[PDB]
Each structure stands twice: as structure tokens, then as C-alpha cells.
Design a binder for this molecule. Structure first.
Ligand SMILES: N[C@@H](Cc1c[nH]c[nH+]1)C(=O)O
Ligand SMILES: N[C@@H](Cc1c[nH]c[nH+]1)C(=O)O
Lengths: 441, 444
């Protein structure tokens, strides 16, 4: 019952999958850099106490390391808490960073295909005291740039504010003590019925039926900027100062989103409440829409988190986003299967048909390596030429440099195109340039 | 008091440290690709049983995950054992891959500076049944290409074979019982004197003086190919078949190393024995030399390990493998110290959209978004009415070369004042031309 296997909910990345990974990360990183972000990295684990008391009910899904006599450690559940720890530890107030790394969650979803316990997040976060809603709006612009550039079909970004959500709960009659647990039930509305949620709130979490009904009247609503204006003219909700400020900030957000040319991509949705306790202002999730045949990014503002870490409680406003690339890898692979990607970049194979020429091949391949050319040879004393061409056909190697007794005497090499099969004599001094000229370089 | 802290022996990477990291990895990866390697990645943990019984006495330094009801898991101690597992699980016999990732070891060294429990390894490994010593020789070529290209001073690569080493103890009269404990004492010769080791073998590990002396006659020796020929003509050692084969393979190795133009960088050193149990043929460590040069400590290592995939395969089928790993943690310090000797940026922003007047935030957001859409790397200060002086100071510190200044009159006229942060010269530029003009000034 030892079996060769990766741990439950984790996968290797094959060369083919790594090719796709690099392509997706390249689009994402090009965008993060375009917005002037620094990059950092943190250890894979933190102290156990670092991650406790931050996430909410999801804290039950953290991987702990064994108590081996030393410190109690835990694998990072996301990149944001480590970011807040980095800020506080270094006493920083202002930084704009991106971070691309794996995170660790003991999930148990119904779909067990793919990497559901160890998966990459691509984060971008702006920390600092700035004027209202500008960095918030930029985060939404970054999401839309990226999702558009990846070309993974049409998408929509749902938006809300935790102040609106919690103020709406107050008007409906939810006590302040239940804001987190009721907000948690509303987060399930993307997977379950309203009836199933309503029953959870009444039967299990102890709400009254009447107030759950009232929550439904708001939660079902979604639209654009006109909905914000509507709710500002709402008689009941306008009397809540908390909600009033959140709505006022979303009004400002939509002004900036329009100037960024992405107001058409945003849905103000009152059912959106994120899964994590630390959000204080805006929150958002992007979802892919279906074209006829048949969440991919998320984030928000979290102004309290660095304060929990600072010795003297000093706060540092932060807003950010994270892109879930695991779904995207499947989609991008399916696009390429629809249109043969290589997993090496070898430009040439040094080869020979005759015997007793391994030494000369090693000389030549090394010469090429020293000139920066991507070169290989078969690890054989006297390989057959047919096998050498087959190795190239399968790898996608475009050229073969063939050595023979006579060619060494003459100071040339036979250069054959793997795809056309045409062969040309090339002077050994010219070989490097000729290879570069043929392979894009 | 709650303590803000990274776990013992681990560090963050600052933006500045990441810039250095990218520079080093870029040299390394350019070389791995040049040799036609595929790339893979594996999870950070394996099953606990995957890593047990492979490394030797070092197995006592593995990080285990908590038993939380499910499987027993462990953080990877290196990249080679996961590689062997990848091969066996997928039933592969032939693959040439590189892998750059962090590894996890509960070390306790005297020096506590830096990342000593979580650190990167850059591995390259060739698996397959091939003709003798060709892939082995290529691994050594890769080490020398890389260490030269990083420009971290002069270096030397020590080389040996486990068959030579184990055959040599036998002729000196060490019982098969003690091969592991005596091999462990000889591994200390890169840090301590021969006398101190000899005293450890005699007094503490119970060896006879006469046989420890005999071990010294071999172990103290190091040189190039002539030493290999010397030992082949050795009357005692030539009678050991195991050692004879290892010497024969090193003879062949030096022939190929010469053709690769790196025979001058290799020292056949009999005092070299690596720390891991799984090596079967050649083994090697690279060490930086000081400015005979002495020897500062090791920066790359590897060898041939023909038994490891066999331990994983259900039916015991072996897959010969040879490889190397580059320890980049020492290299980061050296490369940083080189740059301190000669101001590296941590962003690539080409331009800051700016204004000196008030009521122009809207127009700045329009412009910066225009630029983003044209692929230009652009920023603005998150301020309604920022001061121009502060905007120029933000650029000076960040290394941003250009500032695009908007004013009421400039919008009317359809132009932008473009100012160079480093020269301080300002030119009017038509708004249509702005993207091209920025590109033309900041490369391409
Ligand atoms: N860390 C959050 C996303 C986020 C990034 N920045 C702010 N929020 C998550 O894991 O879903
Ligand atoms: N895994 C070895 C190095 C190695 C790579 N390939 C063969 N050996 C180490 O960490 O020391």
C-alpha cells in the first residue's frame, strides 16, 4: 500500500503544462509590471500564530506542520496575510507589489480533478494612505486587462462593499455579532439556492424568518451605476452611515472605471460577499460568462489587517486582487489542442552517419554551446542517422548538422533541414551565423 | 508579546533581492535550455514514505506535516528524489529535465545568517540508458558554463567515483561494516585536517593506525588525468574490480572533458565523498577558490545515481540517472556585493503621468489608461492635486526616466510636456506622438 502518487489535491506540472504555465504567467506579469509593481517572495510556511484569527471559518482548512520540538508552523493559506506580515515586520507604509506563488488549503470540493489543495495565486496589492478609490479602481483595471489579454472568452466582474453589506444586514435586523456568519451564508449563493441559504440562516444560524426575507429583497438585486444611485435614494438604507459611505465610494469608483474604459465590464451585485473576514471596503470577483456551448479572479480592500500585526496597532490601508490560474490553464491548453507546442528550444542536433566520430561531435556541440546556440547530440558512440532524424522530428528540432570524414577535411558541415529534408554544405566558420539566421535569432 | 518573524532559517526576498535572483536564474536557465532540457515542477510536499530510506543519516532533518487525519506528508528535502518518483510513477525511461525550486531541511549550522532551512536548488538531470560517460561529462560542462557566466570569481570542480572510494577502503583493510562511518569521516576533509580525521577514525571509530595511514596514502592525493593513470598502474588497487571500473570510467570522462575544453577545471580528488547515500558512479562538488588558491566552500554538486528509480518501480526496473544542482544562496550574496561595489531598479515604469495645476485628476486617469492600453508602463500618484516637486522625487527614487506633464493649455493645444527626469530637459510632444516618443526614448 505504498503507491506512487502525488498528495491528494496536488499535481506535478509536465513539460507541456509548464509551457502553458509560462505563457499565462507571461501575460500576467507583463501587466503587473506595466502598473509599476515591485515583486517579492515569502517562505512557504509562516508561524502558526501568524495565520490564525485572520481568515474566519476557513481557518479550519490550514495545513499545520508537525510539532518537531521547535516552532509551530503552518503552510500559507494565501498571499495576503504574508504580505501584511511583511509590511508590519519591516514597518512599511507604502508599497505596491506583485507575488506569484503556490498556496495551501485542505479543501474537499465535489470536483476532485486538478490541483485543488495546492494551486498558484497571482497577486497584486497596493498598500498606503492615498486619495479615495484611485488604487481600488486600478486593481479592477488590472483584472480586466489580464482577463482580456489571456483571451479566455468573455467575463464579468461583480462588485460590492462590505460596509454596504453589513449596513444592509443592520437595516434588515441582523445584530452586529452575526455579520460574519450571515455574510458567510450569503457567499454560498454562487453554488446553492436562495431557499437553501435562507434555511441555513433561519434553522442553523438562528435568524428570524422575517429578517431573512428582508435580506433576500436586497441580495437578489444587481446592476450598474444606476443601482448605486437608486440605493442612495433608498429611505431605510440611507439612514445607515456605514452603508451610505460605501455607496458614496462606489459612486466614485464608477466615475474612475468609466475613465479607464471598463465601466461596461462591472456589475454592482449585492449577493457578493467574499469568503474571508478581513475585507473592509470594496470587494470583487470576476466570473467567466458562457458563450452558448457550455471564479477566476478575486480581491478587495482590507484596511485592518496590517493593524493586527503592528505592535502599536498602526493601520496601513491595502487593496488588492488575486488571479486563479488553475482554471485558466485548462482553457488555454484546450485552445492549443484546437489549433504542436515544443518543450525544448534546441535549434540543432549535431549528428553523423559514419562511425568513429563521437570525439568530433563533442567538439562541435561544445563549440556551439559556447556560441550560445541551443544544441544537442545523441549519447551514442555510433548512432544511426535515421534515429537522429527521428529524434528531431519528435522534438521539433529544425536543423541537423552532419559531420563526415570528408567534411572535416574540407572544413565544412552538411546542414540539413529536418522539415524540408534539403541539405546544404556550410563552412564551419559560418555555421553559428547560419543557424541563427534560420531559427529566428 | 507576539513576535513578527519568518520561521527559523527562512527569509523573505525583498524587491532588491528578487532583482538579483532573476539575474542569477536567468544565466542558469539560459544554460539549461541551451542543453535541450525540458522543465518540470512538483508539489512542495511528497508522501512521507516517498522520502524515507533514500538520503541516509540526513533523513533525520526532514520536515513532516501534521497528521490531520489524512495522509502522512513531508516537505521535499531535495529535487532528485521527487524526480525519481516522477519517472517511476509515469513509467519513463528517458528524460532530460531542469527544475528550479525551494527545498526544506531542518539544519542547525553554526552560522544562522541567511536562508539555511528553505533555499533554492537549480537542478539538471539526465535519465536513460546511454553510452558510458557522455551525459556525465555534459553535466560537468554545464557546471563550468554556469559558474563562469555568473562571474563570481575562479572555481574548481572536484571529482571522484563511489566505486573507487569503496574499493579503496577494502584494500586498506576496512571491513564492509564500516564503509558508511569511515566514508563519513573522509567527507570532513574539506573542513578539517587529515590528522584530525585520522584521529577520529582511530580513537573514536575504532580503526587501526596502520589502515588509517593506508587510507591517507590515497585520500591525500588529488590531481588530473595523470593520477587516474597512476592508480590504474597501482599494484594493490588494480586487483579490486569495483575500483578498476570506476577508474576506467574516469579515464573516459577526462577524454570527453578535454573535448569540451574544461579538463583544466577538474580535480580528481580522492578525499571527495558526497553526503547522500544514493550515488553509485561519479560524484562532484564545485568550490570557489580565493583571490595554489585555497578554497572557500562549495557552490554546486551532484553525481550518478543508478539505483534510485529502481527503489520506486514496482518491479525494480532501474533507470540510470546523472545530475547536478547549483546552490544559489551563496551566489546571491556575491552578486549583490558586486552591485553594491558599482543603483538597480525594482520597477520598469517608463513614465509618470503628472500635473502641476489643480482639478486635473480626471485627465491624468484618461492619459495613464491610454498608455496602459498602448503597452506603456505608466504610473500616477494617487492624489487629486499632487505637487510637481513630489512627482519628480517619486521618479528620482524609482528610477523612472520620463514625466508626462498635463496642464489646461496643453490639453487645449493637444500636446503634452515631456520631461526627462535625469537630464531635466522638457519638450512639447503632440499627444498622438506620445506613445511612439516614449518607446523611442526607453528602448525599442
Ligand atoms: N488573498 C485573497 C485575494 C486577495 C488578494 N488581495 C486582496 N485579496 C484570496 O486568497 O482570495
Ligand atoms: N539532490 C542532490 C544534488 C543532485 C542533483 N542530481 C544529483 N544530485 C543534493 O541536493 O545534494
Amino acid at each position: 500500500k505504498f503507491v506512487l502518487k502525488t498528495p491528494k489535491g496536488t499535481r506535478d506540472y509536465s513539460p507541456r503544462q509548464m509551457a502553458v504555465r509560462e505563457k499565462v504567467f507571461d501575460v500576467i506579469i507583463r501587466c503587473f509590471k506595466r502598473h509599476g509593481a515591485e515583486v517579492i517572495d515569502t517562505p512557504v510556511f509562516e508561524l502558526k500564530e501568524t495565520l490564525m484569527g485572520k481568515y474566519g471559518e476557513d481557518s479550519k482548512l490550514i495545513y499545520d506542520l508537525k510539532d518537531q520540538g521547535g516552532e509551530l508552523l503552518s503552510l500559507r493559506y494565501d498571499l495576503t496575510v504574508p504580505f501584511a506580515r511583511y509590511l508590519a515586520m519591516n514597518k512599511l507604509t507604502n508599497i505596491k507589489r506583485y507575488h506569484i506563488a503556490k498556496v495551501y488549503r485542505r479543501d474537499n470540493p465535489a470536483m476532485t480533478r486538478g490541483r485543488y489543495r495546492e494551486f498558484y495565486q497571482c497577486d497584486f496589492d497596493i498598500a498606503g494612505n492615498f486619495d479615495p478609490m484611485i488604487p481600488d479602481a486600478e486593481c479592477l483595471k488590472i483584472m480586466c486587462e489580464i482577463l482580456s489579454s489571456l483571451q479566455i472568452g468573455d467575463f464579468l466582474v461583480k462588485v460590492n462593499d462590505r460596509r454596504i453589506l453589513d449596513g444592509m444586514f443592520a437595516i434588515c435586523g441582523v445584530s452586529d455579532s452575526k455579520f460574519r456568519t450571515i455574510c458567510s451564508s450569503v457567499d454560498k449563493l454562487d453554488k446553492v439556492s436562495w431557499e437553501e441559504v435562507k434555511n441555513e440562516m433561519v434553522g442553523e444560524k438562528g435568524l428570524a424568518p422575517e429578517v431573512a426575507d428582508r435580506i433576500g429583497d436586497y441580495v437578489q438585486q444587481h446592476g450598474g451605476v444606476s443601482l448605486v444611485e437608486q440605493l442612495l435614494q433608498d429611505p431605510k438604507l440611507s439612514q445607515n452611515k456605514q452603508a451610505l459611505e460605501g455607496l458614496g465610494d462606489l459612486k466614485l469608483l464608477f466615475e474612475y472605471l468609466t475613465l479607464f474604459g471598463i465601466d461596461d465590464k462591472i456589475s454592482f451585485d449585492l449577493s457578493l460577499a467574499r469568503g474571508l473576514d478581513y475585507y473592509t471596503g470594496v470587494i470583487y470577483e470576476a466570473v467567466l460568462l458562457q458563450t452558448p456551448a457550455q471564479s477566476v479572479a478575486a480581491g478587495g480592500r482590507y484596511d485592518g489587517l496590517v493593524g493586527m500585526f503592528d505592535p502599536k496597532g498602526r493601520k496601513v490601508p491595502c487593496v488588492g486582487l488575486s488571479i486563479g490560474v488553475e482554471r485558466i490553464f485548462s482553457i488555454v491548453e484546450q485552445r492549443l489542442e484546437a489549433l504542436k507546442i515544443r518543450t525544448t528550444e534546441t535549434q540543432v542536433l549535431v549528428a553523423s552517419a559514419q562511425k568513429k566520430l563521437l570525439e568530433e561531435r563533442l567538439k562541435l556541440v561544445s563549440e556551439l554551446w559556447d556560441a550560445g546556440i541551443k544544441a544537442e547530440l545523441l549519447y551514442k558512440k555510433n548512432p544511426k542517422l535515421l534515429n537522429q532524424l527521428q529524434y528531431c522530428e519528435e522534438a521539433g528540432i529544425p536543423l541537423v548538422a552532419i559531420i563526415g570524414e570528408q567534411e572535416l577535411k574540407d572544413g565544412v558541415i552538411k546542414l540539413r533541414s529536418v522539415t524540408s529534408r534539403e541539405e546544404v554544405d556550410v563552412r564551419r566558420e559560418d555555421l553559428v551565423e547560419e543557424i541563427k539566421r534560420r531559427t529566428g535569432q
